[PDB]
């Protein structure tokens, strides 16, 4: 590999540099406009997400088939963690794009979405209480990529250990005692279980919206969604 011989600062440097940009909405609400805006954005972010993933150390070392599988498993968790991250400094709101801040009130508009909006807002608030940092965030999202589909399968689990080592290095650099370090490592990784939950509930609502055919979906989004069932 190569990911395994990077130092901790180099690993975080790599992940900071791979980071995708914050995109803007094609914006100039109801069920159709909500879903049309959101799925257009999701489609656009997905293309950037795919090129981000190839820049995650250790990722390109996998076979194309394993890369496909990990991205199909995790793409919604990754869009969600990004959304919740963007939204931190905007309490009670979700920043889908800098020109598209949405209240839970607009989540009502779509059938079944207010439940997901509330879970996302909770996650964001939780990230805020914990004072989550950017360096930690990029580690978490890389962890999601490598971990989420990893069971349907060593190098990859060694890569995950390298990222753990990296998170700990960031917290120690930031001054935390050893005990604050393992407690905070635990708090962060537990949040990934809730991000998983949100992704599964979101995927189910995406399929439901696919079926109700309220909005046409991009072929890419259809294939990302299809891979889940």
């Amino acid at each position: 590999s190569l990911a395994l011989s990077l130092t901790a600062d180099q690993m975080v440097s790599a992940l900071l540099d791979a980071e995708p940009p914050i995109l803007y909405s094609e914006y100039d609400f109801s069920e159709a406009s909500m879903m049309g805006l959101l799925t257009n954005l999701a489609d656009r972010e997905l293309v950037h997400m795919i090129n981000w993933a190839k820049r995650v150390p250790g990722f390109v070392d996998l076979t194309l088939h394993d890369q496909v599988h990990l991205l199909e498993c995790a793409w919604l968790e990754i869009l969600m963690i990004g959304l919740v991250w963007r939204s931190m400094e905007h309490p009670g709101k979700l920043l889908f794009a800098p020109n598209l801040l949405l209240d839970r009130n607009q989540g009502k508009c779509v059938e079944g979405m207010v439940e997901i909006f509330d879970m996302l807002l909770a996650t964001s608030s939780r990230f805020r209480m914990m004072n989550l940092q950017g360096e930690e965030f990029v580690c978490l999202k890389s962890i999601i990529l490598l971990n989420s589909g990893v069971y349907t399968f060593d190098h990859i689990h060694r890569v995950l250990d390298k990222i753990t080592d990296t998170l700990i290095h960031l917290m120690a650099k930031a001054g935390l005692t050893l005990q604050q370090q393992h407690q905070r490592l635990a708090q962060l990784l537990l949040i990934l279980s809730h991000i998983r939950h949100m992704s599964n509930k979101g995927m189910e609502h995406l399929y439901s919206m696919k079926c109700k055919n309220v909005v046409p979906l991009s072929d890419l989004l259809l294939e990302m969604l299809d891979a889940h069932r």
């Binding site: 293309v47 795919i50 993933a53 190839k54 194309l64 890369q67 496909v68 991205l71 199909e72 072929d219 890419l220 294939e223 990302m224």
Partner: peptide, 10 residues
């Protein structure tokens, strides 16, 4: 012929 298969290659 998955789109993702192409986009991971480009």
């Amino acid at each position: 012929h998955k789109i993702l298969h192409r986009l991971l290659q480009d």
